[PDB]
Symmetry: C3
Subunit: 231 residues, 3 copies
């Protein structure tokens, strides 16, 4: 059942390679940088892939893998992803917050909501009672939908009042994040952690591609542009 | 290994009030332009929402665990500490922000609140019965330190802001010093310490203090003049 | 080879609980007055470090913070409670140092986060069942520390040598203390019960107790007596 600890190793190893090179890249590129504003963006955007490197290595080496009893058998679960996402997503949000110079009110309401989204997901991923896992999923999705709402119908208007570079950069990112983040509830749902439509194998591969691109990718769009009165 | 069955009604009622209290605070902060009042709404809404998630887990059994102390397995709801760990520092942040407290006292405060819950959690999961009280004492000492700065510290600075501020804070300060200090008493006499009171009534007690300490504290706050705006 | 524990190093943990608790009451019954908001931060940060450590030292004393990890072919005792402590403690020591040199929000985050990976990774290696892998995590955690010390040494110095002669002097002493005491942790752990068998858990608990007391209570003193915290 979702025979793990061996098939998806190549995906996990690959995810570790990209995330690590992606990190060494953003490290051996932030070298100069004087502007204190651009300093935040480089800091935030380098820890995201870095944290991920750590977590992908655990899954590859086994540690981040655990078994849960549900549906009818011993089910392989990678909790290490929620260890990653728990911190990683809020940093991704901080980048956009700092880029649109959002109010401290929305930043908190955003990070805290993000906390519930991952937290609730972790719960559902480890819940033993099958039916309930989807109660947590629904709650986690509602949390993401709220975050995506303020990013789309909230951070755009405030972005379209900054500089043409800012409004244009935020938008590309906003597009990449509303799309990449919304796929997560879908993969989770059809994967080893919900219905068994798709095997852990493909559930690892899909996450590894959405991850690299929601991180190394998102970071490339951001760090290569004019990061608000700094570059 | 029943553990979670009698107090289901309390937990479900607790999940109910925490859910509605949140939706209420969500479908109430709709407008709000002032960045200062924005903070208060953001802080005050996460508290009940966080508690919703945690009460649900207890009701669905997940937030329940068996601790082997005193020749037996014991029904311990760790989910309260998962809740409290984050929830309480937020209630204190509202207060800090209301009295425009220094970043020094905020950190000292939050830090201390972290020790309070963390220690309580440790005590609640300790196998050696005796020790559980050592941790309870250490936790109470931490609470006592917190309530001090809130009472004999945050008041003086509140009585120098505005008549709305000083009056609002005082009502909250009254509600928090009273509700917060009840917790160590319920824990001590409950299923987590001495068996004076069954897990049942305890779950009910916490559920009444939780709803008021959050949805109640929230209402008093979100109805008054919350800094630079409303 | 190694084997079960929970009693020889009771004294080291007791003494460690001891010093840490006193050091905290000392820093508490010393921050009594203090009106300056700038120095306020420093007292608030420097007080919690030992307070957190007291809690984590006591747990290791009362057995709670001890656990058994299977590896190398046999079960083994590990004190995870240190990592619980360090996770929150070390970054506060960095915050004190960042606030002193008035460091940029960019580097504070780049510092805290790196510290998170440093402890976190350490914890992971400490709990890894496959023996070979534990060193892979060690290597990584050390690389994280090394970075952290770099921005402190070859980074916070130059920004310090531009503040006030008090600041520049206070920071250098601390910098000297941290770079020296922090760099021992990877050495103790590598030779200790959580790595190779060179030295028993007994002495490894002792070593960390010496290093913890000084790196916190010692550091805390050098700092709260400098007034180069703009507070009097
Ligand atoms: O599942 S049942 O509701 O039917 O009753 C209990 C038993 O089935 C028991 C033995 O299988 O398992 C219990 O659920 C497992 C535990 O879940 C939570 O803790 C888990 C921990 O066990 C896992 O190791 C970890 C990931 O691998 O996730 C969590 O930390 C707690 O609720 C525990 O109390 C519980 O035993 C089940 O409740
Ligand atoms: O073999 S001994 O009897 O001599 O000692 C063992 C027993 O006392 C046994 C009793 O069940 O407990 C063993 O320690 C258990 C672990 O306790 C703590 O971890 C718990 C975790 O297991 C629980 O899931 C959770 C809530 O239920 O609380 C804690 O996190 C830690 O102290 C672990 O290190 C310890 O192994 C004891 O060794
Ligand atoms: C954010 C601060 C407050 C907490 C930091 C916590 C650390 C990142 C550790 C994260 C541990 C995760 C949530 C554990 C989930 C349950 C796993 C089965 C435990 C495996 O040890
Ligand atoms: C179940 C989940 C989706 C509930 C989500 C709750 C939200 C994260 C709470 C955030 C604060 C709410 C919106 C009330 C304050 C109103 C502010 C204008 C929000 C943005 O700062
Ligand atoms: C303000 C910031 C620091 C906190 C934001 C909100 C927090 C992340 C709270 C959300 C925590 C969720 C419910 C997860 C709790 C931990 C899980 C019960 C662990 C399961 O082992
Ligand atoms: C596994 C623990 C140590 C790490 C995760 C802790 C959470 C981030 C917040 C606090 C939750 C406490 C520590 C959980 C205690 C053990 C419970 C049986 C966990 C059930 O998920
Ligand atoms: C065991 C318990 C009581 C320890 C509590 C320790 C405190 C959280 C430490 C906070 C910092 C102390 C008060 C020193 C700074 C002095 C400030 C005037 C305190 C309020 O900001
Ligand atoms: C806001 C931040 C920087 C300061 C506050 C940090 C908190 C004081 C740290 C929490 C410490 C408590 C004692 C919890 C330690 C870990 C738990 C005892 C583990 C339970 O398995
Ligand atoms: C203080 C709040 C954030 C909860 C504590 C967060 C710490 C990361 C958790 C402390 C436990 C560390 C990580 C070790 C986990 C493994 C232990 C066997 C779990 C016993 O609780
Ligand atoms: C594996 C270890 C060495 C990776 C550590 C990476 C760091 C957390 C990243 C910090 C940001 C790097 C230095 C790139 C931005 C340059 C800035 C001057 C950093 C301080 O804001
Ligand atoms: C404040 C936030 C945003 C930044 C700091 C976050 C930390 C760097 C995140 C910690 C990541 C390390 C690898 C720990 C992951 C969780 C542990 C491996 C769980 C052990 O059971
Ligand atoms: C190999 C070198 C670079 C390691 C780092 C420096 C050394 C740890 C220096 C020792 C630092 C202070 C004196 C603490 C020593 C504590 C131990 C009892 C030392 C045992 O040799
Ligand atoms: C709503 C929802 C989820 C959303 C996850 C997201 C949005 C992950 C983002 C990952 C990133 C950004 C990685 C770097 C979870 C947690 C899968 C739980 C199931 C439902
Ligand atoms: C001192 C002490 C405690 C304090 C708990 C408090 C003050 C809880 C506040 C709850 C809120 C605010 C709910 C929302 C614990 C943790 C029960 C452990 C026993 C001793
Ligand atoms: C790099 C490395 C480590 C560094 C630890 C440090 C530097 C601890 C500092 C402790 C203090 C200051 C205590 C108070 C760990 C985590 C042992 C893991 C093994 C290698
Ligand atoms: O990740 C697989 C390989 O991809 C190549 O494009 C990189 O240059 C290598 O460094 C990497 O190992
Ligand atoms: C083969 C290593 C380079 C891959 C580039 C991927 C960019 C997201």
């Amino acid at each position: 059942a979702q025979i793990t600890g061996r098939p998806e190793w190549i995906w996990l190893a690959l995810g570790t390679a990209l995330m690590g090179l992606g990190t060494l890249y953003f490290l051996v590129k932030g070298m100069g940088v004087s502007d204190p504003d651009a300093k935040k963006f480089y800091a935030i955007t380098t820890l995201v892939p870095a944290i991920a490197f750590t977590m992908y290595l655990s899954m590859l080496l086994g540690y981040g893998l655990t078994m849960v009893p549900f549906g009818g058998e011993q089910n392989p679960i990678y909790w290490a992803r929620y260890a990653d996402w728990l911190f990683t997503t809020p940093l991704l949000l901080l980048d956009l917050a700092l880029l649109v110079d959002a109010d401290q009110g929305t930043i908190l309401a955003l990070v805290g909501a993000d906390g519930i989204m991952i937290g609730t997901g972790l719960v559902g991923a480890l819940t033993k009672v099958y039916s309930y896992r989807f109660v947590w999923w629904a709650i986690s999705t509602a949390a993401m939908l709220y975050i995506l709402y303020v990013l789309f119908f909230g951070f755009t208007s405030k972005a379209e009042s900054m500089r043409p570079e800012v409004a244009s950069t935020f938008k590309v990112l906003r597009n990449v994040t509303v799309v990449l983040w919304s796929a997560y509830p879908v993969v989770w749902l059809i994967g080893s952690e919900g219905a068994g439509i798709v095997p852990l194998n493909i559930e690892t591969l899909l996450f590894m591609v959405l991850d690299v691109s929601a991180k190394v990718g998102f970071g490339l769009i951001l760090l290569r542009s004019r990061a608000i009165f700094g570059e």
